[PDB]
């Protein structure tokens, strides 16, 4: 059980670290949600004016 303590400690560290990267984990896949937002008019309005 002692060794398996480290077995699971490494796994939990892996999960918690991949979950501590992406914000800790998810805004590496959201924060440009702001981009999918702003570029709405960053592109269309940039061409909306000229159209």
């Amino acid at each position: 059980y002692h060794a398996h303590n480290k077995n699971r400690k490494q796994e939990i560290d892996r999960y918690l670290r991949t979950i501590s990267s992406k914000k800790a984990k998810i805004d590496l896949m959201k924060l440009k949600i702001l981009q999918h937002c702003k570029e709405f008019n960053a592109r269309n309005s940039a061409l909306k004016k000229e159209k």
């Binding site: 059980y1 699971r8 939990i12 998810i26």
Partner: protein, 49 residues
Amino acid sequence: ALYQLITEKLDYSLKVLQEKFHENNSMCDELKRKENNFKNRLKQLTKDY
């Protein structure tokens, strides 16, 4: 005399190790499924990107 208290210490160590092993059992699957939900958020968020 060394026997009695050394056996006491080993019983205490066994109990503590059982506690910590049972603790470590859960959080691994916990982070498994919570990172899984992170992916799901990305999984269902294939829309974005």
